Design a protein around this ligand. Sequence first.
Ligand SMILES: Nc1ncnc2c1ncn2[C@@H]1O[C@H](COP(=O)(O)OP(=O)(O)OP(=O)(O)O)[C@@H](O)[C@H]1O
Ligand SMILES: [Mn+2]
Ligand SMILES: [Mn+2]
Length: 383
Amino acid sequence: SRYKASTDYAKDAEGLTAPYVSQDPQETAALVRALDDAAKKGFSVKKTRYAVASSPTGAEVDSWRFNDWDYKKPDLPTYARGLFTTRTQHGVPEIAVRGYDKFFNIDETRDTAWSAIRERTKGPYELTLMENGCIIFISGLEDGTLLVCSKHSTGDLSHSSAGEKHLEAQLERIGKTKEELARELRKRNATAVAELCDDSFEEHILAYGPDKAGLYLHGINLNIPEFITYPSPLVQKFAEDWGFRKTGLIIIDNIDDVKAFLEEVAETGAHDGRDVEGFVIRCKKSTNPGVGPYHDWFFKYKFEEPYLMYRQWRECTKALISGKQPKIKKHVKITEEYLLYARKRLAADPKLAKLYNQNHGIIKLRNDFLEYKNMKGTDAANL
Ligand SMILES: Nc1ncnc2c1ncn2[C@@H]1O[C@H](COP(=O)(O)OP(=O)(O)OP(=O)(O)O)[C@@H](O)[C@H]1O
Ligand SMILES: [Mn+2]
Ligand SMILES: [Mn+2]
């Protein structure tokens, strides 16, 4: 529309002030108590302990994974998606890593029905581009160690190490170190939340060539049981200061404009000339509208097409490579032709199957077929 994803916000961020809330050891220990009771099953959580290989005090961290069901229940001790717990060298219990609260796509839950959002949220609405990769958490442990995790893990080429290597490069580029980053993040009591996007490491659906590749900072959260997240202009500033790639942002005051905007982009699945997987919308939510305490609250707007078709193509090719039956659920006749074109490309280049299995060549194979068909991915999806 007349709206533009932008990355020049970081300079209005000087008027704003980062939120800060310290950790209450008592609060944290009760949260861990309740988490361990849920791990002692017989809501349900699963706990995994990891060493922190570069921690000079041998810190360990405990990752808590809920299944997506439990987040729709009331009365959970926390709603973090991605949560890591620890004891410092002095025995203090702490949240080492806190992700976003599990958030949901439009119409996926009662709260993410458009009518529910109109009623129970207030603006302004932060429209943050949804980069297509894997989530990466970064924080600073008490002994100065820079902790890098994937959504539920941190050992070793794991996603978390690939994320860390990328962080090492960006910090080298700006002449800063991990230890300075760890001190800054602990100073803020915060987890940095980034999307790792690199076709050379792993392909997803949209492309990320050698430029464009790296860690896209889209969030900073307070390491506390409750959900408090930085406003996105403050995130973009932190990205600049610490060498992250920034996540594009639109701010729309009115919620009816948000719906119309998101629907317009959804016709193409593209915005400002670039393909876009979706938006994550950030605002304040009330238990019941009118007044009430407002807390931070996200919802997803994941554009259905042509990305569903691309995803079906990905899974159908893997099923072709493996011996399993390709699941054709949508875009029937064009997927018929895609699967025949793929079979021929595999016959003429037998090593593709191994590569495709390891998530290299997904995007190229799709784009080659669309070339052969002389179509844009959008029109192929619209058949
Ligand atoms: N601007 C953004 N704001 C929030 N999340 C983003 C953003 N851009 C990309 N993401 C990624 O989107 C994910 C949520 O959308 P997606 O549909 O990929 O969910 P998912 O991978 O099934 O994970 P979950 O089960 O945690 O929802 C986050 O885990 C995060 O890695
Ligand atoms: Mn999920
Ligand atoms: Mn994703």
